[PDB]
Amino acid sequence: KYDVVIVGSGPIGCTYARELVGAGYKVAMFDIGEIDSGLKIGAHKKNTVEYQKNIDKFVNVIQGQLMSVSVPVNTLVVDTLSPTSWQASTFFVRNGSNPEQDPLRNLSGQAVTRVVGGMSTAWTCATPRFDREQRPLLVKDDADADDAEWDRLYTKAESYFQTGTDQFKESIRHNLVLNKLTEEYKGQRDFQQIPLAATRRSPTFVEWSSANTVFDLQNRPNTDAPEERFNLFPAVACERVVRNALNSEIESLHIHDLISGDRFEIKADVYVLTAGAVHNTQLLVNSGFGQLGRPNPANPPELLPSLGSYITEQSLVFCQTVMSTELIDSVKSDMTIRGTPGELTYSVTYTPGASTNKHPDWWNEKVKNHMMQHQEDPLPIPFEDPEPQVTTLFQPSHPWHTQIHRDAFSYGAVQQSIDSRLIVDWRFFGRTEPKEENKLWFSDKITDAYNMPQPTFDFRFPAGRTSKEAEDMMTDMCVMSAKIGGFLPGSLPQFMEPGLVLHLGGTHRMGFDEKEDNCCVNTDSRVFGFKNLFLGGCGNIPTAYGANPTLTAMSLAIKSCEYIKQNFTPSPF
Amino acid sequence: KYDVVIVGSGPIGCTYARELVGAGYKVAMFDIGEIDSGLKIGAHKKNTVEYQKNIDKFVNVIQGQLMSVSVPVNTLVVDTLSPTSWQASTFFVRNGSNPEQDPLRNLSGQAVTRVVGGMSTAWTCATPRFDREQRPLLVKDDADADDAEWDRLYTKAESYFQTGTDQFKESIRHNLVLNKLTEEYKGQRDFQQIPLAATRRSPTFVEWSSANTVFDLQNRPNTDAPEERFNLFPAVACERVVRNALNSEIESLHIHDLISGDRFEIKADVYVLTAGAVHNTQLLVNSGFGQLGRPNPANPPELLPSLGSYITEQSLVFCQTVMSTELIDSVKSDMTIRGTPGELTYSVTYTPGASTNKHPDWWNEKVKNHMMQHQEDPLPIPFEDPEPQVTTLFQPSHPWHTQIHRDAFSYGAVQQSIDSRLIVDWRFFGRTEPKEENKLWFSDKITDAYNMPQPTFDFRFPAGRTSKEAEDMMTDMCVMSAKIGGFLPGSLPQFMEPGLVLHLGGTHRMGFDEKEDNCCVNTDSRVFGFKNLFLGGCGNIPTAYGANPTLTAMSLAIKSCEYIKQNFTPSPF
Amino acid sequence: NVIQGQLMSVSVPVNTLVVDTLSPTSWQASTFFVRNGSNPEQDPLRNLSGQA
Amino acid sequence: VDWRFFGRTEPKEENKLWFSDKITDAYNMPQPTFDFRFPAGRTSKEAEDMMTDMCVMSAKIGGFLPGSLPQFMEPGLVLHLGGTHRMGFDEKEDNCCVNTDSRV
């Protein structure tokens, strides 16, 4: 028996833990995955000296913990086997494939992570706010009050994640790109650093944020928190919440301890599901919410009929570019060069404080020293210069989020022939209208690796605005990127596989009224009809959004915890 | 000040820790890498429920922690850049490439791991003994005594690693392959399970061994070892051992703390280098042993002239096969089948104890139940059947090691069209003659990511026996694999990139006499001339070997620790 | 190239490759319909795909 | 050096070339359709013995060239299709279409 049980140790479960552990509740958290980040539990796996000296290797960490959600039956023909080798005469269900899944209506890129800290052990740490157009209402019919509430919640969420907008301010590459885009779109669009949940520790090391930054996940009481009560139980699959007959309260959480193999019940006053947008939905459907099995309008669900409908996933377009000659030359515009590199007389100088100069003295000092100390190198950019981290945020006239940066999630073999200092990534993210017909559903016959109902998608990007904007977004990336350089062969402009982006929303969506707003939870993230069941995560977000969703989910979680603190009393200690 | 300092927390450093911590020495261990395996420090990263349900993902873990040793300057032509993109007019040194390295005399596949537990956090756990022909002598001119000494040491090493030869005995696939090969080579060759450092915990989970199994790496004193003294210091680059002027003793270890950035000296009575075959050599050369820079016979080293010469790396050939129809049919040979799958009357039965039957009752029960419970599946092998783990060990008439198995280190995109139950890997490992001209050397101008002398290889597989055997080995794999099935398209018979195998030896090789045996350390792993400096690892092994080397290195380490225990006194506690 | 330019495949089964990186604006069918001269009679697993 | 080894295939009644009664080819003729598998038994055993023979023989000349590793080619690439209108002495006894003068 606990006051609060939290299912999942990602950043949203850790928001609940931070708030409720600190308010004096006796809290248990369960995660199906295991401790994986070193002694700081749930921390970012990129925070090792070795990864930040070898950042192109971190893609492997990401791939090693992303398990595909739904893989259709494979129908590739291999007809070069030896005649002696066994073969079936059909494309039978094999290798964990989902025979429920239509390959042409999938989110094939969707994947999940089962590790303590969830996906925050690997994420990019981009934490923009949503503007009004992307954001669910929290206050009706008072836009200024709605704005104020979101400001309060986002400010707190940014403190929990340690979001900032200046960690890359000393990068030549970053400023080169930022300034060029600002000049080219003079006035029409604004560019800034991507807001990043990160703290720079040195010129070559950034402590990226994670679940661990939100809550350190150490069992309590302990020496630094002697009056707090928290236990984390890894390798525990949560399987079901038990409803009372009234459908007004949850009475227990059924768990499966994966090490001992045993199944148990856990009692709490408050149950919080933060297993991610897929797995929250799976747990609820396994518990009698929504409808199990292939959708069937001749059998409508008794509870939460919009659960698993109106799902959204963003369109993602990507390319990389190779910096233009004009931009590279501009880095060294303040330099006077005499002689030829490698000779006795070679000299690269700048007149400091000359205001015929384009750059600050710090920039020019970096460049001069690189040029003098590495005369065999043909570029003016220092070797350890950090990557660009640039955005123009979503606006009505460009309704997509943008990142102009270097991401550790590379999508192809990493090329080695072109100097890495020249390369910039472009990722533009589109917003998807919620539609009832877009669904996440769970099989009544097929099970996943943990013996739970197999997830199945029925998804297409909506016709209309979603599709038109997606193609306008692609064009915008082609036009904007060209101001910085031409495309890099092997990273030409492309749409990524649906759901690779991992910004799935709306699977258990929020609204004011269950029926009118086709929703599952209220603005306190409380499941309609239930006193003591709350859902956290991106699954709550009911709108068409392009920006990265986690900060918005965390903000909703903070609001949810206010409701809990006001309506449930911590047990005596 | 410590009694013993150990550089590196791989399985060989942990052998030294196990032996010396337990004998009451005050021990410090430094590793340049960080804690990465969860709460069990230095443990195998495959020991998570999630990886063993998704084993094809573990390749990513391996790739994410293998950093190439020496990458030659890239000369690929990309001529499809936009005219606006910057480009150099030469193939200049970029992206961390090593301009010292001849691309045609490299071990391009060689890589290192910088993580607590070293490569044992990811390894395959194959731990065969070497036979006489592969093994260095420990006793001269008394082969039976030599045998006895190796038996004693290997027995102890096998206890430390928890090596066994029965963990796969209940696999249908394993036994199918094993038995077929035994029959086909009736008498001529013997097949057995690969010896594996592993303990099966359930039919679907194996606790693979690692450094952590050898020594748990927890600081001591602690509750379970209250009279022991050990500290592990991760994120500490060891840079130099300081020689006294006599070249008879090491007086300190120079370290660089990578978090604080500070450099310190550490004093011990005994210094143990277990940084791996590359990095032991780098540390020694950085300390004044051997010769820094491009080899030059007009400037012979004052100390350890054979350091970094006589290096060996194994040839590796690989393929995968798809099980033959005849073998698949044999799984179900004891079954009577009536009706057609999916109908009311379908029946798969066996007569238990009939000794017209080919298989034991347990096998037939597994098959019957799979066939009855999964009538839509066309194969008789159960879904969770473990992989084959088969070897015929090196012999004079087939002087290569073999593994007929499923390894988590896949080398290509994992194919999805052919059922995984059908697939078997084949890896044959050849022995390489030590030759003085095969060298690992370190640049006097180029530095690696940790500001240490850049490693450079000058390597070719020797002409003569090595090359002839390598090609005979390839042919042997082609002939043997054909008894099980035809090749799998996309995994056709091939030599792997030189050094991918990661069995590099001989970089600081062992022998009885420094000059006569062209060696660096004696049979106690003590560096000649030095009272208190010991080297552990594969770098010690001076012979041409085909089998996996770690168990042999650990056995040498056990012997080294006997010498230490007999010649150095632990400080009072 | 001469050889390839004059070898016309005898029987090509219906293609079932999934391309899911098209733009949302591009037309697509909801099935693997008979297209590009493929032979819907042909079992892809009992063919001489190289015959030409 | 290239290595190409060619195996013999037992004739079996079940291996067929047939023509569609609905689908037509580019010249508006009945579309050809194959129903073919290499026979179990001798054909398949020999094919795999042939592969092994190529691996053993080629090794006396040199190692494989990366990108041209030992492989079976797509069925029928070889273009040595036979027996579609086969010869024999007696139509029924020898399951055939033409006599030894190639007369139908």
Ligand SMILES: Cc1cc2nc3c(=O)[nH]c(=O)nc-3n(C[C@H](O)[C@H](O)[C@H](O)COP(=O)(O)OP(=O)(O)OC[C@H]3O[C@@H](n4cnc5c(N)ncnc54)[C@H](O)[C@@H]3O)c2cc1C
């Ligand atoms: C490579 C990558 C880059 C990303 N970059 C960004 C970015 O820059 N900005 C951003 O906003 N978003 C980003 N995302 C998305 C972001 O990581 C997620 O939105 C966020 O982690 C969701 O938090 P969560 O706590 O709701 O769920 P998760 O982080 O998914 O955590 C859910 C947890 O629940 C557990 N669990 C699941 N099922 C069960 C069960 N049945 N029982 C018990 N436990 C269970 C899991 O093991 C997991 O740890 C990125 C994701 C990835 C992988």
Ligand SMILES: Cc1cc2nc3c(=O)[nH]c(=O)nc-3n(C[C@H](O)[C@H](O)[C@H](O)COP(=O)(O)OP(=O)(O)OC[C@H]3O[C@@H](n4cnc5c(N)ncnc54)[C@H](O)[C@@H]3O)c2cc1C
């Ligand atoms: C994928 C894979 C599969 C393998 N499978 C097998 C197998 O089945 N059987 C087998 O016998 N072998 C196998 N090997 C090889 C085996 O893992 C190594 O032989 C073994 O780990 C070597 O042990 P070690 O302690 O000498 O060195 P390592 O395990 O390399 O450990 C050396 C340690 O030293 C540290 N270090 C390096 N430089 C410094 C420095 N300057 N200062 C401080 N610390 C430093 C490193 O961070 C590291 O942790 C495999 C390896 C890999 C990667």
Ligand SMILES: OC[C@H]1O[C@@H](O)[C@H](O)[C@@H](F)[C@@H]1O
């Ligand atoms: O695919 C990588 C992308 O993944 C998304 O989940 C992140 O939000 C982006 F920041 C990131 O660039």
Ligand SMILES: OC[C@H]1O[C@@H](O)[C@H](O)[C@@H](F)[C@@H]1O
């Ligand atoms: O490349 C993988 C191979 O790596 C080697 O280091 C191991 O010893 C083998 F067991 C393993 O199959």
Ligand SMILES: OC[C@H]1O[C@@H](O)[C@H](O)[C@@H](F)[C@@H]1O
């Ligand atoms: O695929 C090419 C082969 O084609 C066959 O038709 C020829 O008979 C062979 F000689 C030739 O090598």
